[PDB]
Amino acid sequence: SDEPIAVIGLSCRLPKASGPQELWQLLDDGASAVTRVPADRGARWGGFLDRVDTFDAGFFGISPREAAAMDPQQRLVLELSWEALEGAGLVPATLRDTGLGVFVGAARDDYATLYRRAVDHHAMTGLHRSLIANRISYALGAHGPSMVVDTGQSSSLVAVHLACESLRRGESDIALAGGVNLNIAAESARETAAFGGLSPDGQCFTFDARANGFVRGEGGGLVVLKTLRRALADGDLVHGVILASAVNNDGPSDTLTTPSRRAQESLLTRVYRRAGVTPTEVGYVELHGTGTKVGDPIEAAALGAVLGTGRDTPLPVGSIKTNIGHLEGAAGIAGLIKALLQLRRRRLVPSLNFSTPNPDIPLDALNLRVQQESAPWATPTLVAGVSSFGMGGTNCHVVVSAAPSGPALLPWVVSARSPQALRDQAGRLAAWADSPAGREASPVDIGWSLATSRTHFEYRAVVSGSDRDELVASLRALASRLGFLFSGQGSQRAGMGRELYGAFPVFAEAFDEVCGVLDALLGALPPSEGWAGSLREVMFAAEGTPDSELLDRTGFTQPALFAFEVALFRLLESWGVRPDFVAGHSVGEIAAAHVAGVLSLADACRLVAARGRLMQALPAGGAMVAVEASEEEVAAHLAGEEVGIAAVNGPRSVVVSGAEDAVEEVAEHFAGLGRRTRRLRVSHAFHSPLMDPMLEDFGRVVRGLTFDAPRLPVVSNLTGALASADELCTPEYWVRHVREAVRFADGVGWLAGLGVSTFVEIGPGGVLSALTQECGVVAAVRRRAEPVALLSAVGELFADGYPVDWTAYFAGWPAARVELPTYAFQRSRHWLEN
Amino acid sequence: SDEPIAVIGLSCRLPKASGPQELWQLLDDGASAVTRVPADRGARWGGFLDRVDTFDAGFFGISPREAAAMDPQQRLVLELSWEALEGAGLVPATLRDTGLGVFVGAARDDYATLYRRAVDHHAMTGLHRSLIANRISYALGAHGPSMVVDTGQSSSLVAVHLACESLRRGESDIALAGGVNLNIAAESARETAAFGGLSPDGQCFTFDARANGFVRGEGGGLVVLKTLRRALADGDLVHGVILASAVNNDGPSDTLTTPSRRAQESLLTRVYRRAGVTPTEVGYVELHGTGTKVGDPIEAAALGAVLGTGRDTPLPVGSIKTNIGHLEGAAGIAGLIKALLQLRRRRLVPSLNFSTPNPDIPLDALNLRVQQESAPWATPTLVAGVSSFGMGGTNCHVVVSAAPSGPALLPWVVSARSPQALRDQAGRLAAWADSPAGREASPVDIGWSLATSRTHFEYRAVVSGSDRDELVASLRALASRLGFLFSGQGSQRAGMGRELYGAFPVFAEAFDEVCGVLDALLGALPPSEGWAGSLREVMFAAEGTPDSELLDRTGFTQPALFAFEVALFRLLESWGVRPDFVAGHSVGEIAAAHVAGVLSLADACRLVAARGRLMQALPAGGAMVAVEASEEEVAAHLAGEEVGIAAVNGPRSVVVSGAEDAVEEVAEHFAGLGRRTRRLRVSHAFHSPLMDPMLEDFGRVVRGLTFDAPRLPVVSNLTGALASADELCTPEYWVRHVREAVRFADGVGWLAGLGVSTFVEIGPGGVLSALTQECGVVAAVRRRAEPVALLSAVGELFADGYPVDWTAYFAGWPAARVELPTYAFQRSRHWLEN
Ligand code: NA
Ligand code: NA
Structure with missing residues (x-):
């Protein structure tokens, strides 16, 4: 008859049940949450929440002063809205600017009564009942219809009907529905006592001979609803399916507040028809079930006539009001939430306060039974009914069914x-x-x-x-602002990339693409005589094997760092991690230039393969020493005498490069002054006069390539500054880059000044990141x-x-969504001063 | 897009406009209803009702003590529900046990606040906001959905949307929708003052440069809604057609209470689409239009963008809030009721408080104009928009169009x-x-x-x-209990039935059927030699003409009274007027027996035609005298001596009948005692020994007839008591009836004892009714x-x-329904003691 509606989520704050797991533990244990009016706070009994005064105002961006003037019911429904959406697995910010509707039943304003028994501008919105719904809409930036309904004690279940109808019209694409009732003011206690409806024993004796009125309860709950079609399509967890819902009024009843059997019968008949469901197919009904002498027998008689008649097994029935009291405005949503928990646990739970049937309720003639123990529940799919009735005659019934290697x-x-x-x-x-x-x-x-x-x-x-x-x-x-700093020679290591390649197919695919292009270049002109192997086997071979020793020949080292850095860049891209700026030390500037779009993969591969091969062919005799000394000291010392500055790595960290003997002369100078010095493990004197013989050959290689203007900003360690488009786009730039000093410290300075807050090193350890702090620093791949x-x-x-x-x-991964705990609110007291 | 919804009725209680005619007179005159806080009661101004304390409790069966504890808003909506249904031309009792839905916007509880600033059981239902709707349902015995909605200042127009949707689903077959807002407690005045929204001048300067907040108004209104299809089919007066309605929320606005241009634009676009209506086709928009600096320009900007853009003529706009103040919860329904009055008057009316455009509202760029004078309104059908917006962001827009010799x-x-x-x-x-x-x-x-x-x-x-x-x-x-008493001879009169025959075709058709059967019988055997005429011409001929003289010959008189009495009985039947008991004097007992089903028309015609003809053939010499004397006196006097008692008409009224000379002997006896006596004008001595010669002949006629058991109770003036079935079903009964005395007084006594409270005489004057009081008495046809x-x-x-x-x-008659005034309530003061 009607499009079915999936419940994809729920939340609750009920007496002794501060969420749905706890609620199940109270109901499954057959326990009462009814107690005596707490300290802080038939009317000396009720179901109470632990605190009604506490809220995490901070979490919702609400000031303590707004929070103090705010009805606790508004505070509670903000928390339940957040919890319901988390329970459905929805990230609330994705609902911003969408068609989410909010439908809340609320029939009581105790906070406003306290306030009216020093008038500030927080009171207006803090005390207006409409903001129970609208404040949710505001906080989530929702554009769906947002409203409070008042039918007295059927309000929260009418709210669910209206939410279902808004979804079936396409007015809402998702809805929050339910209600709230907090028993805060003594004034509301009296007016209910003086009507006479309260049990002087403080129990709802539902369908039982002691039946002598109801006991009050407070709390709230929400369900998250979508069309079953939309929820399946979106892969949501379905808790339950609403097949139909109906609302009517008693009409001409004996008094204003006497329920109508005829109206209840008409309601049930109509709703079970549209639901397309027979009486034998229904497995359980959550009663309104308040334990009043007038009401209990009329509800029993109507259910017997419509749902008991068609049957050959007694219909089990129960009321959560026997556990938690009568939540009035929020009574229905409590009842629906119990039915949904029953449906998914596929268990029924005790109705309390029952031993002897009400004499006016002929259970056998009606074909009903009060559920008195926990028990499995099986096909007579599972179907449950939920009734909620208002003292002014507005009745609601919901028919709900069960849901249909990394x-x-x-x-x-x-x-x-x-x-x-x-x-x-x-x-x-x-x-x-x-x-x-x-x-x-x-x-x-x-x-x-x-x-x-x-x-x-x-x-x-x-x-x-x-x-x-x-x-x-x-x-x-x-x-x-992320600054990627690509590593240079000295950062290679035996097995570099092998673990990434084993773990991450995005790395492994980018790596086999780079290595495939480089294998062809090294195969054509190997930097080891005979070699037509795989670069990947050289890089991944165990420390101290023959393949592994090839990794330290600059003819393989320069391509190995290129392949490792590009594959890692691409893996990071697939995780949404991408730079605002790039820069590299020496050969790392080629990776930087590649991922910035200056060079195609083919051209960058050709450049680094030749750079390595032409340098490896240079003769023995070259050395490099890192010196603890400023650029100005090392250049003053060299000017007074083959050798030069290969790198300016910090305000007191320089590398000198050239003929081994002249380098050793400068080393013992600085050592002699008591400075730290370290001989680098290098086959050649990189960025020195000893590069002079391969410049013309290299210059011929780079003149065969294409240079495009960078798509990302690139810092040049030649100029020590941001590169012009035109800088990196001349063959000559890349010849100079081989030969002259790497101005790494000035580069790091230039990136700071462009707002880089975090430097990440892209390569197989942490050389460039020690250097950078020495000038946020994270090493992408550093013992582990x-x-x-x-x-x-x-x-x-x-x-x-x-x-x-x-x-x-x-x-x-065949991902299954899993039900995680909801947000750990950090609650403080927020209350009126008097 | 959506099934259209007819408004078939409305009602209102607004400042200086206590119904819709008055409302038109206020708006058409371009008058303000805003005033200073009355005696009894920016916040020293408002639109007030004359009294809020008075109600006709008596009319609704509510006790003065229930009425005193009852929110005036509940009292007001009972009156408006009754007035709206009367305005639609619906008799409320016909809605008993039907699908009538009640949807009411209400966002304020001032009466409850007064009460909480001696606790009795009327307070519970008197102070609960849900009973604003549900008490209507109860009073009318309605089974449709019955609910209060709270969206703050859009509540009443959201209520209309929900009513429209319930009708389009088939959940309601008719709905009452609108809202109420009464400004009774000083507490609500303060909290609105302290929010800062009030105009310190006490005016809504809608779209005007003084715009400095709103002035408060109170009142209520309702529309009566049906599907346009159902309303046409039922022949209702259509006031207006709702083509579409929409509700949304502002979502992520600058603050909780700042309106959203984007949300308003989205609302308008969506609703005009479903309505299937372009911006040029829209003739007027009723604005929310509260005269706030933030709000006025956002509403103007949204309307310009969606409705002003498409145009080449400026869109006129206005707000009733410039006349009556801001009714908050009931603001929307006031606005809709103004648009409906505009639609049916086919006139626009001034928006007050306007002279200089708000600098932030570029009217020309937006293509809007503030309506400043009364004026005709013509095709650009007429279409109007109505907006109502809540401080928590819930917005509603309704698109409403004009309706499509006795x-x-x-x-x-x-x-x-x-x-x-x-x-x-x-x-x-x-x-x-x-x-x-x-x-x-x-x-x-x-x-x-x-x-x-x-x-x-x-x-x-x-x-x-x-x-x-x-x-x-x-x-x-x-x-x-109605007792019909059919007239006997002496009640005939010249022209009897002619005026009824001229006035009432049911009389004229029943009369020509009876006269047709009798014409055949009198034609076969006339009681005037030669006569083969029309009985109708004899009865209708002018006093003292020849035809008229025939009317007094018992051969025509007895059939004439029969035809007149039957035609009148049938006319009364067609007006729903029918007896519980029948009885007749002499020949009137034959009509009584006929309409009670004892005799067919054919058999009753044969009986009365022969009764008259056989009596007319008797010789001259017979007389009857009415005597003021008891049966016992006349029978004692006759026993001591041709003559007998023809009738016992009362405890001291007897008619004696027989040979003229013997009758005259008894007459002068009673006259001699000083009693009243009257010679009847009779051709014969009816119910006397002089009937003796025609009994055997008459007995042969009645033995040819069929007698069935009466379907109505018949009193016999032979027995002076209720007739057994078997009494009236023997030929012999009707021979005895000719001959023996008419026990008319005992008959009247027997009918009293069977509970007859009213005696109506059926015949051409008032003889039998003088007689009956002499023993309620109305003569059906008595100077006029x-x-x-x-x-x-x-x-x-x-x-x-x-x-x-x-x-x-x-x-x-081609009946046109006409709009009559509504019920004259007789209002008393009903109020809390402190
Ligand atoms: Na009722
Ligand atoms: Na807003």
């Missing part, structure tokens, strides 16, 4: 809006993860869920590992496996506010 | 629930009838409307006449025309609570 290294992402909240979130995720429930879930699905189904708030941590116990232990511990060093670095960019695409880390 | 003697039926209310109702109907408006209406249409489109309350009058001036003068004067005497008698049965079908009086 990375080796696993990141668990966690965040919150304060340090204390992040410690809590970690604690809570630890505890859940360790739980029966948590242990059901794959650690890959948990990861995926943390990455894709949660907000990345301001305070972030990433924990990583191979299994649950490691991830959990790292959570328990927690509880208690490459995937661990990489995730730790990307973890640090994320914790500093970089938008890492954690979802793409999980690409190619 | 009885000679006229009854005006009028009723009310008290004598004072009936005097008022008559006064008000007089005044309206005399008005330009009233004078538009046919006096036949007014009659028809009073009969078919109003409740027949407990205190009834009928005024009748030939034209407006006579009917009106009779209203101004007003302002300051037969139709006037008949309507006066039927008027009296109606005033005593008989359900006369006045609608059928008007059968065969």
Whole structure:
């Protein structure tokens, strides 16, 4: 009859049940939440929340003074809206500017009564009942219809009907529906006592002979609704399907507040018809079930006539009001949330306060039974009815049915809006993860869920590992402008890239593409006589094997660093990690120029293959020494005498390069002054006069290439400054670059001045990052496996506010969404002064 | 896009406009209803109702003590519901047990605030906002959905959207929609002052440079809605057609309470699309238009962008808030009711408080104009938009368009629930009838409307006449178990039935059927030698003509009374007037027996034709004298001596009958005692020994007939008691009936004892009714025309609570429904003690 509506999420704050797991534990244990009026606060009994005065104002950007003048019901529905959306796995910011509708039942204003028993401008919006719905719309930036409905004690279930209808019209594409009722003012206690409806025993004796009125309850709840069609298509978890809902009024009843059997019968008949569902197919009804002498028998008689008649098994029935009291305005949504929990647990739970049937309720003639124990529930799909009736005669009935090998290294992402909240979130995720429930879930699905189904708030941590116990232990511990700098020779290492290649197919595919082009060039003109092998085997071979020794010949070293840096750049791209600026030390400037678009892969491969091969053919005798001394000292010392400055790496760190003997003369000068000096492990004197013989040959190679203007800004370590388009686009630039000093420190200075806050080194360790602090610094790949060093670095960019695409880390896993705990609110007291 | 929705009715209680005619007079005059806070009661200004404390509790069956504890807003919406249904021409009792839905916008509880600043059980329902809707449902016994919506200052127009959607789903078949806002508590004045939104001048300067906030207004209104399809089919007056409506929320606005241009634009675009209506086709927009500096320009900018852009003529706009203030919760329904009045008057009316455009509102660039004078409005059908916006961001827009020779003697039926209310109702109907408006209406249409489109309350009058001036003068004067007794010989009169026959085709058709059968019998065996004429010509001929003299020959007299009585019985049947008991004097017992089903028309015609003919053939010499004396005296006097008792008409009224000389001997006996005696004008001594010669002949006629058991109870004036089935079903009964005394007084006694409260005489005057009081008595046809005497008698049965079908009086008139005044409430003060 009507398009079905999926529930894809829910939330609740009920007496002794501060979420849906807790609610199940109260109901499954057959426990009462009814108690005596707490300290802080038939009417000396009720179902109470623990606190009604506390709220995380800070989380919603609400000032303590706005928060103090704000109805606690508005505060509670902001929290439940956030929790319901998290429970559905929706990141709330993606609903900004969308058609999300908010439909809330609320029939009581106790906070406003307290305030009216020093008038400021927060009171107007703090005390107006319409803002219970509209403040949600504002906070989420939702454009759907946003309204409060008042039918008294059917309000929250009428709100669900209106939400369902808005979805079936296409007016809303998603809706929050339910209600709230907080019993804060003594005035509302009296007026209900003086009407006479309260049980002097403080129990709803639902369908039972003691039936003598109701006991009050407070709290709230919401469901998240979509069309079943839209929810399937979007892959949401379906908790339940609303097949139909109906609203009517009693009309001409004996008094204003006497219920009508005829109206209730007419309601049930109509709604079960549109739902297309017979009485035998219905497995359970959540009653209005308040335990009043007039009301209990009329509700029983109507259900018997419509749903008991068609049957051969008694219809089980029950009321959560026997557990939590009568939530009045929010009574219906409590009832629906119990039916949805029953549907997904595929269990029924006790109705309390029952032992002897009401004499006026002939259960056998009606073919009904009060559910008195927990029990499995099976096909008579499962179907449940929920009734909610208002004292002015507006009745609602809902018919709801049951719903119709990944990375080796696993990141668990966690965040919150304060340090204390992040410690809590970690604690809570630890505890859940360790739980029966948590242990059901794959650690890959948990990861995926943390990455894709949660907000990345301001305070972030990433924990990583191979299994649950490691991830959990790292959570328990927690509880208690990007500048890419590409590495140069000296940063190569045996096995470089092998672990990344094993872990990450994006790396492995980019790497085999680069190595494929380079293999052809090294094959044509090898820098080892005979060699027509694989560059990948040279790079990945174990330390001290023959292949591995080839890695230190500059003819292989320069291509190896190029392939490693490009593959890593591309892996980072697939995770949304990309630079604002690039720069490289010596051969790393070719990778920089490549990823900035100056050179095609083919031309960059040709350039680095020749750069290496033409340098390897130079004769023995070349040396380089790092000296602790300023450029000005080393150049003053050399001017007073084959040798020159290969690099200016810091205000007191220079490399001198040339004929071994002349280099050793300058070394013992600085050493003699008591400065640190280090002989570099190099086959040749890079960036020195000894390069002079290969410049004309190299110059002929670079004149065969194409240079385009960079698409990313590039800093030149030749000029020590930002490169003009025209700088990097002349063959001559790249000949000068071989020969003259690498102005690495001035480069780092120039990038700072252009607003780089974080420097990340792209290459196989941390040489260029020691250098940079020495002038945020993270080394992309530093004792630990490459995937661990990489995730730790990307973890640090994320914790500093970089938008890492954690979802793409999980690409190619059959991801199952998993139900994680909701946000760890950090609640303070916010209350009127008198 | 959406099924269109007809408005078939409306009502309003607004500042200085206590209904829709008054509202038009305020708006058309370009007058302000804004004033200073009255005596009894920027915040020393507002639009106020005259009284908020008065209500007709009595009319709704509400006790003064329930009424005192009841929110005036609930009281006001009961009155507006009754007035809206009367305005639509619906008799509310016909909506009992139907699908009527009630959707009310209400965002304020001032009465409850007064009460909370001696706790009784009327307070619970008196102070709960949900009963604003539900109490209507209860009072009308309606089963449709019944709810209050709270979106703050858009509530009443959202209520209309929800009502439209319930009608398009088929959930409601008719709906009441609108809202209410009463400004009763000082507390709500302060909280709005302290938010800062109030104009310190007390005016909404809508779209004007002084724009400095709003002034408060109070009141309420309702529309009556149906699908346009259902309303056409039912022949309702259509006031307006709702083509589409839409609701959205501002979403992420600068603050909670800042309106959104983008959201307003999106709303308009969407709603005009579904309405299938271009910007050039729209003729006017009723703005939210509150006269706030932030709000005025955003509303102007959004309307310009969506509706001003498409145009080449400026869009006129205005706000009733410039007349009556800001009704907050009920602001929208006021706005819609202004647009509907514009649509049906086909006029636009001034927006007040305008002279200089707001500098932030570029009217020319936007292509809008503030309506500043009354003026005709023509095709650019007419189409108007209505906007209503809530401070929490929920916006509503409605697109509404313009709608797509009888009885000679006229009854005006009028009723009310008290004598004072009936005097008022008559006064008000007089005044309206005399008005330009009233004078538009046919006096036949007014009659028809009073009969078919109003409740027949407990205190009834009928005024009748030939034209407006006579009917009106009779209203101004007003302002300051049925037992049918059929007449016998002596009640005939020249022209009997001629006026009824001229006035009432049901009489004329029943009469020509009876006369047709009798003409054949009198033709076969005439009681005047030669006669083969028409019985109708004998009865209708002028006094003292030859035909008229035939009417007094018992051979014609007995058939004439039979035809007149049967035709009149059938005319009364067609007006729903029918007996519980029948009885007749002598020949009237044959009509009684006929309409009770004992005899077919053919058999009753044969019986009365022969009864008359066989008696007319008896010789001259017979006499009858009515004597003032008991049966016991006359029988004691006759026993001590040709003559007998023809009738016992009362405890001291007997007729003696027989040989003229013996009758005259008994006459002068009673006269001699000083008793009244009257010689009857009779050809024969009826019910005497002189009948003895025709008994065997008559006995042969009655033995040819068929007698069935009566379907109505019949009293026999032979036995003076209820007849057994078997009594009237023997030929012998009807021979005895000719011969023995008519026990008329004992008959009247027997009918009293069976619970007859009203005796109506069926025949051409009042003989049997003098007799009956002498033992309620109305003569159906007594100086005045037969139709006037008949309507006066039927008027009296109606005033005593008989359900006369006045609608059928008007059968065969092209009836146009006419808009009559609504119920004259008689209001008393009902208020809290402190
Ligand atoms: Na009721
Ligand atoms: Na807003």
